[PDB]
C-alpha cells in the first residue's frame with residue numbers, strides 16, 4: 001500500500017554533490033563538485049531528501065579544514081543544513097513521514113542534490129521556503145544560547161557582534177523580545193539600517209566608528225550579555241565592556257577561521273583576573289551539546305516565523321558579483337561572499353526545479 005518512493009529511486013539514479021577532497025580552510029581548495037555520483041538509498045529509519053535550499057555557514061571552512069575531527073581524512077561530504085521534499089524513505093520512517101512532505105534538517109552532507117537524513121532528526125516544515133531553513137542552525141543557536149545562558153530580562157544591555165548576519169539577526173530580535181537594550185555591530189551603513197529595522201537600539205558600523213570608544217562613552221557601566229561570534233580584538237573589547245556579573249557568550253570567532261590554525265589571537269593572560277574582578281563569565285556554546293532543547297526551540301521559532309513575529313532575512317546572493325546563488329556550483333561564491341562580509345541575513349543557496 002504505502003509509497004516509499006521506490007519508483008523515484010529507480011529513475012533518480014545519479015546526482016551532483018560537493019566533496020571535501022583535500023583538507024584546507026580554503027573552501028575552493030578543499031572542495032570539489034562531483035557529478036554522476038549515485039543517489040544514496042535510505043535505510044529503514046531514514047528519509048531521502050531532495051534539497052531545494054542549503055545553508056551556507058561560517059564553519060563550513062572549519063569542516064573543510066578537518067577541524068571537527070582531524071583524524072578523519074577526505075573524502076567526505078559537507079554542508080550542515082537543508083530543506084526540501086521527501087523523495088523516498090524507509091519502512092519505519094513511513095510511520096511518521098510521507099513521500100513529498102516538506103522537511104528541514106541539520107546533518108552533515110546537505111551540499112548535494114539528495115541527502116539521506118535519519119527521520120529521527122528531520123523537522124516537518126509547512127512548505128519548502130528559505131525562511132524556514134534560516135531557523136535550523138542560525139535561529140536555534142540564538143534561541144537556545146540566550147534562553148539557557150543569557151539570563152535575559154527587561155532592561156539588560158546586550159551586545160551582538162556580526163549582528164546583521166545569519167545568527168546575529170536572531171540574537172538581535174530575541175533579545176529585543178526579552179525587552180533588552182540591544183547594541184549590534186556590522187560593517188556597513190546599509191547593514192546598520194537593517195539592524196535599525198530589527199529594533200536595534202544602537203547599531204554600530206565598526207568600519208567607521210570604533211566599537212570600544214562607543215562602548216566606553218555610551219555604556220560606561222558596561223553590558224550584561226555579549227553574543228560574541230567574531231573573536232580576536234572584538235572578543236578583547238567585549239571582555240572590557242562587561243558589566244559586573246556580565247556574561248560573554250562565545251558563539252564563534254569567524255575572524256580566525258581562514259587562518260591556518262583557525263583561531264583568532266586574544267589577550268587571555270589577565271582574563272581570569274578580569275573575570276574575578278567583575279564577577280563576570282565567558283561562556284562557550286556549541287549547538288550540538290544542546291539537542292535536548294532543539295525540537296522545542298525549532299517549534300517556537302517556526303511559530304514566530306509563520307505568524308510574522310520574527311524577521312528571517314535570507315540572502316540568496318542576488319547582489320553578489322555573479323548574482324543569485326543557484327546550483328551547488330554557487331556554494332563557492334557564497335562562501336566567498338560571507339568572508340567578504342557582504343551578506344545581510346542568512347546565506348542560502350537554491351537548488352531549484
Ligand SMILES: NC(=O)c1ccc[n+]([C@@H]2O[C@H](COP(=O)([O-])OP(=O)(O)OC[C@H]3O[C@@H](n4cnc5c(N)ncnc54)[C@H](OP(=O)(O)O)[C@@H]3O)[C@@H](O)[C@H]2O)c1
Pocket residue numbers: 056057058059137138141161162163164165166167168185186187188191229230250251252253254255256285286287288338339340341342343344345346347
Ligand atoms: N556555536 C555554534 O553552535 C554556532 C552556530 C552557528 C553559528 N555560529 C557562529 O556564528 C558566527 C556567524 O556565522 P554565520 O554562519 O551566521 O555567518 P554570518 O554572520 O551570516 O556571516 C559572517 C559575518 O561575519 C562578519 N565577517 C566575515 N568575515 C570576517 C572576518 N574575517 N573578520 C571579522 N568579521 C567577519 C561579517 O559581518 P560584519 O558586517 O558584521 O563584519 C559577515 O557577514 C560564526 O562565528 C559561526 O561560527 C556558531
